[PDB]
Amino acid sequence: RWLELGLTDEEKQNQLEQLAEQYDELKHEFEKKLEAKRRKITQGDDLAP
Amino acid sequence: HYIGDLVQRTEVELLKTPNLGKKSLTEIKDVLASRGLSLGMRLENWPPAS
Amino acid sequence: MNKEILAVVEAVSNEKALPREKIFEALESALATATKKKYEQEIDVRVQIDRKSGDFDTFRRWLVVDEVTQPTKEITLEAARYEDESLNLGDYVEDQIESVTFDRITTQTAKQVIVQKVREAERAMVVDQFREHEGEIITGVVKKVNRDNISLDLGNNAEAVILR
Amino acid sequence: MNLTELKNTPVSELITLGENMGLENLARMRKQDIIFAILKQHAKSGEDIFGDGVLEILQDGFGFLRSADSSYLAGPDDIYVSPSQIRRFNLRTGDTISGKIRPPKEGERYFALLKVNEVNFDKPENARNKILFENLTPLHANSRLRMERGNGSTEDLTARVLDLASPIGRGQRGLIVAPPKAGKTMLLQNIAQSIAYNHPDCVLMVLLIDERPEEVTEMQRLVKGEVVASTFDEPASRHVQVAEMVIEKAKRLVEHKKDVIILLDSITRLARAYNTVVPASGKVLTGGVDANALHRPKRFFGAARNVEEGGSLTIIATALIDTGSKMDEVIYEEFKGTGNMELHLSRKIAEKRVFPAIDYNRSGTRKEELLTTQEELQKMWILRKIIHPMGEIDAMEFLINKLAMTKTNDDFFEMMK
Amino acid sequence: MNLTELKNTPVSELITLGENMGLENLARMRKQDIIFAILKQHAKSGEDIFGDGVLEILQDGFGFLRSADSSYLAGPDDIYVSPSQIRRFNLRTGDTISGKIRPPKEGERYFALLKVNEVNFDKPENARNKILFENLTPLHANSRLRMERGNGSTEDLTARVLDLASPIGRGQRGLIVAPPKAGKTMLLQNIAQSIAYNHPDCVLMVLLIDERPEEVTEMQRLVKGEVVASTFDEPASRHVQVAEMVIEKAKRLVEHKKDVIILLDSITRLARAYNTVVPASGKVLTGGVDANALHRPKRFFGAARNVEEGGSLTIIATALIDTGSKMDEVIYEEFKGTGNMELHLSRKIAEKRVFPAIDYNRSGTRKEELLTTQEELQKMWILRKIIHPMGEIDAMEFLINKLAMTKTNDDFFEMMK
Amino acid sequence: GPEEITADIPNVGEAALSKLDESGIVYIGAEVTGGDILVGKVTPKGETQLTPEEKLLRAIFGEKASDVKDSSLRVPNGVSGTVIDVQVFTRDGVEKDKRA
Ligand SMILES: Nc1ncnc2c1ncn2[C@@H]1O[C@H](COP(=O)(O)OP(=O)(O)O)[C@@H](O)[C@H]1O
Ligand SMILES: Nc1ncnc2c1ncn2[C@@H]1O[C@H](COP(=O)(O)OP(=O)(O)O)[C@@H](O)[C@H]1O
Ligand code: BEF
Ligand code: BEF
Ligand SMILES: [Mg+2]
Ligand SMILES: [Mg+2]
């Protein structure tokens, strides 16, 4: 829960930022998948007039 | 370990034991006394024979 | 939900004949009986539905006595050092919270006990307001006759009994 | 680990302390969450906690212990107390209590009071042996509360003229009548300083209702005493709440045979608050005040009296006039003949930047004969006769000069011969 | 490709730029859709985007980055930020942030913040090491903010009389009390110009709530500073929204140890807005204002203070009086004794077309002794004593003449001897 | 008036309704051997505009719900077994019951 670290910018900051970006992108993609599934299963279906 | 080592112990010696608050104490007083007996009694025939 | 509770307390016919406070007391009794019928063990529970500020929150009454039968509602008169009692009697706990008060059996027992409580309260009220006139001649039509007693109506659903 | 030990030290000490204790960044939380998390993490190491605070009764039955850091309001660090303790140990609003406390147990969110150790600086055993407030027999003020420092500093004049204009006593009823920006704040600060220096035995408390935060922060570090305040950042509900808190604290303390002195600033703000929190009763007069909207100010002010068995409650509030709105005036109107001592400050004198700007003959004290001796009373009458034919402004200047020549008022009185 | 680079240049540059980039006719879209489509088509060529904006917290957890082009409102070009970034880097309302951004990804509609680079003109590494606002110890104003230009232009008089009527300092609490059409706009413009010239280190911001669009467009190109406004084209929801935006921006900036100066015009419009967006609480007084409808103006105004560790927040708002409706009056009423500095402009002086129309002795500053030196204070007292016996109008004319003869106020003071 | 799937079935006791839930659908795992109402379908027959106050009143006080027709669906006489799954589909707009 404490990914926050920092020292020796040149490469450490680059790699840490790349990995944090991958992490947040993965979390956002999974949240998008969950929200799509929710909107899909909660969408009411037509039955008849 | 044994139940006979616990029936001879009034609940006065439980809430003083750590990690014994509300849920644990309620579970203990429920699952132990619902079988007819109770927690805290005076008996001398223990343990026969171990 | 609690919005349904407010709709119920506001959709009563005899509003002042049974005010919000005693309405919510009857509902507390309803939820207590419901929680009693939920668990196989017998345990007294107060609700305190929080008439206007918030929702309900069940509790766990102890009924402090030196007995141990069903220790869910048993605690000695001296257990006061830990769990912050510091008393001799009346020590009750607030362990279990947020029961369910809208399922089938809960709704059934609620409706039944509410009917009972409202009819009892209204009968006692219509009798008590006439109690101040004890020892006076009153009018009123009879309602029903029988071989043991008869019923009389003094107006505004005032039920009176006249024995044989 | 006591609650007050974290209650009084500034936020910076809390920061370094929590950063030492290996905490989540406490700089993201409020003072109350700071103390809450620090006490949490301290108890997580296995210590039994001690605490203190003033009790507030709730309508659900239970009570809550507040501190002067929150100005006696709801907070995460308030200590919950069951109604049954209030029953057995006879608790009520205003009872300050210190004793054994623990953090909220499993599923709770507020501290619990285990063991009572001090009720209003008394043994909880004798706390049940108390006398009520309304059953008291009030009296006039007999003991003199000398306000003169005697050191003869430059500002001390504003105190000596006190002893020459309107005497004070234990349990006095005083009203400060002055327009805005006339010098009430410096006067009140000098009053508090002189009382805390000459009478350190009586508890000193000050009310700031709907004031500026700079005045609050300057007051809380200028007087030697625990102060409470409420700025305009907050609704009038907070003002009335702190009003019951302070008035019940004073009541319980004087019931414990203690001399309480409250300096309220200002009663006009408190009247506005009481009027705006009270519901409409259909009884409206000029200004926009409800008829029952003044019952609460009348209650708060009539709380002042001098007890015979021991102790007293002096209440000195300032009222605002000449504010352009008639409503304020009406307030002052009903507070015209209710007080037996008044400090009248006219803006005409303060307009010349000559301080203190006090109207002498418009000020006075009822039944002041029992507060001073015969020589002092005769000299007061002579001074009043000398100052009466002259006006307000340069006559006040005359008093200021005659006061600045002498060191204390004994030399001034002897010179007046 | 930065967001501000398209944020500040006029619509015409955007037109030619998009017409160069081979676009659908961008003249059919709004400014926000212009920037949105241009950034879309730029990223469609394969560039990583940079952006900036002020954060707004939403109740669903996530945040949105707004710009001053939309006056801090919802728009298609607002940058979405997840709540987890707000957690890790400790974000909140008012935190201006600039860093790596990308257009909304597949199926999304708002820009996403990749990498934080500047939090309130600071490193995001130290952004977590901040001090809160309410934990601050307020004080009085000590540093003087000289408003005089010294060049002696024709309009500069309206500034010099400032240094002669009501001194300003860092963290001052000022209220402009004037009837409509008396000259508040030119006064505020001169205030902004003088501050931006003499003190370019402190950030300068201005609030225009329910104003005319011509005044907004004249303000946004007369002062050297980023301005925000809200005309009457928009509901009061927009006004309260921009109110939180600006007040939280000022709060975060002063938390970052920066001196913020906000010029609000007018507080009467803001009070009307706050009253009309607040729901009814059953507490109505004269004028039609709810009792809790004023809690938000009280909050916004009490936000002003002088911090001790570093930085300050000066808030100078104008109030409207003599508008024929009692409601406005009641507003000014509760804002009567809340401020420690006031600029009183009477319509009687502005009626003669003599500017600036300032009421001298009705104006003043509380605790102004800590803002100026001893010589300056003594000269101020002498000037007040000279101007007091005379009236308002031609006495103001006398001050205007005595100011126009000398070049700066040093010569005026020496001549007053 | 449209139909309702509530649990207020008049002209019948509680034994036939003991297998119904709070919403008006038989529980998941409730056996049935004879003709038993497993869903509380009611339809209004006459005047509409039954006030919600009087609606909840009829469930507690007053007379029975008249415009119901007791058109609920029960299992045919002859089939037995235990229900294992219930399916419900709600058109966009109708209040989704808590079982859905
Ligand atoms: N004892 C005193 N000595 C010197 N100046 C004083 C004294 N009392 C008041 N003042 C002046 O009065 C002003 C006080 O302002 P303030 O505290 O706002 O008054 P109020 O609280 O009555 O509105 C200061 O500018 C100060 O110069
Ligand atoms: N300080 C000043 N210098 C020059 N002209 C002024 C000044 N103050 C007011 N005026 C004149 O008065 C008018 C002010 O208009 P406006 O801004 O609407 O007044 P207010 O802001 O008081 O409502 C302008 O036409 C301007 O020519
Ligand atoms: F303190 Be001043 F009287 F507002
Ligand atoms: F801008 Be004006 F004073 F209405
Ligand atoms: Mg003051
Ligand atoms: Mg203008």
Swiss-Prot record, chain B:
Transmembrane segments: none annotated. The modification N6-acetyllysine is found at K22, K23. Residues 1-50 are annotated as: Alpha C-terminal domain (alpha-CTD). Signal peptide: none annotated. Acetylated on Lys-22 and Lys-23 in the presence of glucose. PatZ controls acetylation of Lys-23 but not of Lys-22. (Microbial infection) ADP-ribosylated on both alpha subunits by the phage T4 protein ModA. ADP-ribosylated on only one of the alpha subunits by the phage T4 protein Alt. DNA-dependent RNA polymerase (RNAP) catalyzes the transcription of DNA into RNA using the four ribonucleoside triphosphates as substrates. This subunit plays an important role in subunit assembly since its dimerization is the first step in the sequential assembly of subunits to form the holoenzyme. The N-terminal domain is essential for RNAP assembly and basal transcription, whereas the C-terminal domain is involved in interaction with transcriptional regulators (such as CRP) and with upstream promoter elements. Belongs to the RNA polymerase alpha chain family. Homodimer. The RNAP catalytic core consists of 2 alpha, 1 beta, 1 beta' and 1 omega subunit. When a sigma factor is associated with the core the holoenzyme is formed, which can initiate transcription. Both the N- and C-terminus interact with different regions of transcriptional regulator CRP. The rRNA transcription and antitermination complex (rrnTAC) consists of RNAP, NusA, NusB, NusE (rpsJ), NusG, SubB, ribosomal protein S4, DNA and precursor rRNA; S4 is more flexible than other subunits. This is DNA-directed RNA polymerase subunit alpha. It comes from Escherichia coli (strain K12). The gene is rpoA.
Swiss-Prot record, chain F:
DNA-dependent RNA polymerase catalyzes the transcription of DNA into RNA using the four ribonucleoside triphosphates as substrates. It comes from Escherichia coli O157:H7. This is DNA-directed RNA polymerase subunit beta. The RNAP catalytic core consists of 2 alpha, 1 beta, 1 beta' and 1 omega subunit. When a sigma factor is associated with the core the holoenzyme is formed, which can initiate transcription. Belongs to the RNA polymerase beta chain family.
